Amino acid sequence: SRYDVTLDQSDAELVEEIAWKLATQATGRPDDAEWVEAARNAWHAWPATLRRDLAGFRRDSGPDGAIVLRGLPVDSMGLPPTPRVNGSVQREASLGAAVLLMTACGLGDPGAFLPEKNGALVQDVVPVPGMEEFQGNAGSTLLTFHNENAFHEHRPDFVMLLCLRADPTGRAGLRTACVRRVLPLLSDSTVDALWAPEFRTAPPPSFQLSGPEEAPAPVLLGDRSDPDLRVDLAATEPVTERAAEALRELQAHFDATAVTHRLLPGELAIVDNRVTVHGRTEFTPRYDGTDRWLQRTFVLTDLRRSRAMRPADGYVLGAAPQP
């Protein structure tokens, strides 16, 4: 399978060397344009085999709309305890930030949203005490299936998750479900419903004090046989009864066809957010610094499209127009 790639020893050693040099020698820090520029240049030093694998995935993300690469460099012996605060982000140069931002520049460009993790390009995904029931990074309850930032016009094209520390408890796993697997299984009425403009996905309160009551829109987008989708099973509200039934059937088939991944250190999951939803199983964190630790970076395949939301042609998307 070209969607599960283990680095051979030589390639893993070359990537480690490149990542260390970037992390230690590049001027500035990960969120600075000059550091992203260094990562972009560093990406082109990677082994050609890996660049070819990623280019292949970008061109065709396959029936599960996801790839896992294994054997990437993480400083396990140097890793501090897993962070325990909401909004934990990687502001300082590190091996993890190097790996993520280099890969981001290979697939497109990294990006982030000002109202989410303060627009940090490399974001920690860790369980936070008191946030157990929360539908987000910090929770440890069941995270229902969603496209990342489904409400947003310039939502991530890819979501990348690098594992620094595995969940020691064995109950946590990333779940990904692709529309390619479910579409041929869906009943005709459900398919019709999903193409109809009968679903409202409002932005979360963090993204606006508020205004424009979101116009109803379809869940399925683009080609009839190979559509994209835009859904959040927590946030998307059906406007009609048939839309409600359709979401229930959609969820059922996501659950039935989802791939569940327990990531290990040095493993990088890349999800095609145009065709694949993700979620996470419930688990019981230890909250003792040994818990699951992933770092996340979003990729925009055509950064240019979001320029109106990126002051100074930066990597942080805000808002506006207005009139």
Ligand SMILES: [Cl-]
């Ligand atoms: Cl490209």
Ligand SMILES: [Cl-]
């Ligand atoms: Cl996992």
Ligand SMILES: [Fe+2]
């Ligand atoms: Fe998510």
